[PDB]
Symmetry: D2
Subunit: 333 residues, 4 copies
């Protein structure tokens, strides 16, 4: 028996501070997407959330660096509640919050909203992948930036979803490296759509969306990595050719690090060098980071991923300083 969004909205209404932070962070990201500001968006944090307490501890550390580098970097935390599996597997905190096959979705939605509210209230904006068609009504008001995953960028129902979101949306290139699907996605999501959706009261209805003018692509590797200057330039030419923004984000993880978390730093160094030389088509970066590096099958060690391996806190400080220094020079030209 599924509680509707209005139940959770009643227990956890958005605060004045959260609402202000979300509104302005979305505006600020739009500025980067359209080349009006030259700060780098940094979407950074765990591959997935499985423990809100560790998430809050992580966020308080990250908040210090968000503040420190606010003139060069726009730091937003990865707060991912839904995970696309290759076949089957744990789908994330919403689907199965007790991490044990009980699928307590009401609890998971409450936890997701409570965490997001707390994050925004402390001054840390949040990002997530929007995978499910129905869950966004429960928490999209607390999200400053959304992703559509590699496995769903080509999907018309996800392009519809994005078209109705009030935050900027990044579209990842396909799992084998297809960029055109993400360019096409921006085209689709930027227009108005009519489709079936579910209201805050829990009832199906006809949605009519206005289109989302703040979509961009995310380069996340394919059969080969696609983060280097040659790839960026080629993606930018294809973006201009379709008449959509040629400012893009680069994912340091997934198929760009080839699932070796230690190579996220190499990718970030390549990005730093691009920003120093020129790097005019880059508006942001994505990084898989947690309190503790690596991964584990079971949630035994605190602050360590149970999905993709992440860099730890120490590498995270180094990586953020690197990008901030590199971007300060880009902004000086």
């Amino acid at each position: 028996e599924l509680l509707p969004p209005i139940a959770h909205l009643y227990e956890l209404p958005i605060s004045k501070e959260a609402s202000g932070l979300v509104h302005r962070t979305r505006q600020e990201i739009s500025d980067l997407v359209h080349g009006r500001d030259k700060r780098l968006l940094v979407i950074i944090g765990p591959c997935s959330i499985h423990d809100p307490k560790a998430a809050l501890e992580y966020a308080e550390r990250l908040l210090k660096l968000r503040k420190q580098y606010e003139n060069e970097l726009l730091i937003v935390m990865r707060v991912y509640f839904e995970k696309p599996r290759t076949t089957v597997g744990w789908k994330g905190l919403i689907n199965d919050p007790h991490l044990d096959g009980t699928f307590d979705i009401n609890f998971g939605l409450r936890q997701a909203r409570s965490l997001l509210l707390s994050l925004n209230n402390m001054g840390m904006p949040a990002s997530t992948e929007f995978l499910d068609m129905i869950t966004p009504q429960y928490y999209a008001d607390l999200i400053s930036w959304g992703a559509i995953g590699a496995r769903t960028t080509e999907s018309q129902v996800h392009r519809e979803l994005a078209s109705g979101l009030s935050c900027p949306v990044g579209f990842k290139n396909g799992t084998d490296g297809n960029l055109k699907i993400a360019i096409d996605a921006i085209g689709a999501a930027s227009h108005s759509h009519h489709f079936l959706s579910v209201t805050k009261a829990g009832h199906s209805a006809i949605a009519h969306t206005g289109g989302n003018p703040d979509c961009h692509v995310i380069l996340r590797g394919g059969k080969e990595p696609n983060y280097d200057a040659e790839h960026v330039s080629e993606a930018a030419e294809q973006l201009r050719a379709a008449g959509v923004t040629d400012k893009l984000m680069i994912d340091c993880s997934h198929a760009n690090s080839r699932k070796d978390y230690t190579r996220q730093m190499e990718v970030a160094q390549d990005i730093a060098a691009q920003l120093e030389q020129d790097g005019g088509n880059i508006m942001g970066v994505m990084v898989e980071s947690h309190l503790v590096e690596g991964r584990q099958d079971k949630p035994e060690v605190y602050g360590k991923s149970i999905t993709d391996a992440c860099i730890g806190w120490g590498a995270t400080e180094e990586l953020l300083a690197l990008l901030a220094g590199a971007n300060k020079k880009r902004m000086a030209r």
Copy 2:
């Protein structure tokens, strides 16, 4: 206001006869999927349905051939109501039945159910692509076989949907030719899932599915076609290695015809030649066919696709006679 499925079900209850046809067609198709019967499933008809009159005229002609070829072929009509676009475009009869950007979804769902009930009552089983998450509750009881399209095979929400459908489901390979995503899809949709869905009364709820044991892959081309014997053999080996059915379906259209409707017949000739020689991994074929060949942007010509170009009626007779003759020989061995 969106009418819930129960409103349409009340006006258009499934009949004894339609219900019997669906049940036995589903079972017959299962038998093909699991290699218990050597008839060839043929999913044939329009790229998209834009005019119920032409649909029922098509059905009337096809029904004769379904019956003529019943010992060699299991003929099921393509009755596709939901169309994935590259970027933007008409998304099908459900989404915009008046073809004029009025998006009269209540009318569209009603007409879709009506057509499907009329088709089944006349003895023609129906197949469709399940693209949307909420629309299936309105008509899935009238569907004998379902496709998940190339653009959504990798999508976890579509694999979830398939896991709860009561008909067999074909998963298409990805738009650039990736077959592994479809094999992964069978493994995912065979399992139980828990996810958010909408009930027949129009309210969101937690769905718990039991898995769909009758999924298979569809070879529909990528950067290159993949219909030939080598590709079929290569796919069957991959299917066996993943522990799933090695009986598959071949699409004569889309990327296998290089989007050229006149090349569907070449593909079918190649399949016929495989069936004559051996062809033991082939359980089905797909064909885009309409009263009149080609395509048009505006619905000016009766019985002519407004989406992908189709072969015409006479070409349809030739293609079905070719496959039935070739499969008669395969079954006789």
Copy 3:
């Protein structure tokens, strides 16, 4: 499952003509309630509807009289779908349309709406008792005048319901003859209320009504009858003292006929005399009339009541000619 009102509204939308007739008739009745017009409202027809066909035949007869007497009388048909029982029994057409304890409420609501639409389309306006809190959303758009029964006039939920209806409403005095509860009810229903109701989509919600300015009392007997000049005079004085309309309706049936249908004419004759002498505080009369007089336990005879006994068609013509002649004289002064 209960279909929501929107299902029925979709199948039986109100026509231009029915809409006009309801609007006009409500306005015309308001004028009577407020003494702007001295025609006599006549709420006439069956105790209860149990057969649509006979109801439409009855309406076709009554229409000729409605037209013949239009300058003196404003004739509106009783089309009562909801029956309040003393302890238990058949609660009317909506609750149990097949008259056999199957409680097929979806069918009953559909049939009630269909009958009302047909009545209005033929030029016959309709009245009913609003007993249930949920059923009115299904058909109130087709009702020109409503009653709150003797057994529910004191009920706060019924007074709230009346406050949100767009038609004039009559409140009957209580079953032992208490008139103050109906005076009290006009007061309550003329005010705005907040309470829980159900939407046209079938979902509970908070209703905020604006009050119904067109309510009045109905004298329907108690322990003793209350139709005479003395009683009318007493009620008018009490009405003025409460600051509400002193124009009232008199029921010729129920406790004013001592539950004996052959006494309705006697009551009508008394009223006729009052109209002739003065009768300034009478705005209307109610009469239980059917094709065939009396009642029956089973629905064996066509056009004969299965609830309270009614006068038959011959007596109906006499009663109406009587009231028209008497009111023509009132109106000439």
Copy 4:
């Protein structure tokens, strides 16, 4: 937007202790309704609840006496959240919890459930008048005894409601003294009914109830008081003639005390005298009591009624000692 009952049930689930108390108390009352136990039910407490804190303080005091008198009296608190008005006014803590015309019904339902859970958790069972058709789903699980008020005992929708409640229900006699309507109500409520209702999820549905076997009448005065032995003997006779339970309850307040709240003591003395002579048909009494006696138009004094005037705490001790003492004697015969 109205939160459905499931939202409140999620925040405030019934505890094991509260569940057991309600279950046990309903059964205990049933035993008194059907003559299996001769303890006297005493429904005692405020006319209406307007301040949860005072209500809990009152309950802590009453609890001590509930335990002290448990062999003679079965004490259950009046926790009335819905108030029927003569015309207009404050309809209770649910309809307008802030006592200022803001009608914050979401808040009021939450506060009502919270108070009820806390009462049950401390060991005090609770009673209320069920006036509205929709609100009971929010808190009926915490109610051990229910009333249908004098203004609604004749109403078929209230009899329907009663037929589906899982607690015993008392039907009050009519405002002018009519006892037959309450006897008819028991008859009606003991039967199965079909009717439209709203589910815990906030959606309209067809309810099919099983009948309520534990209903009884309440004597609360009329044109004349009806608390004495002669009226009780006449009531019992009429009950036996209708074939329903001849055990009844006597309200010491309302039209039995008329314009003197202190007269509840006289009524109680009369009842004590009946219990001492014989008093075999009395199974309960009702008393309006609060921390501080009297009433006020505005909620200025802590623990003093804002609707009907109540006896104060010292008089409450006195009235309960009186009844316990008298009933101890009846029980010893």
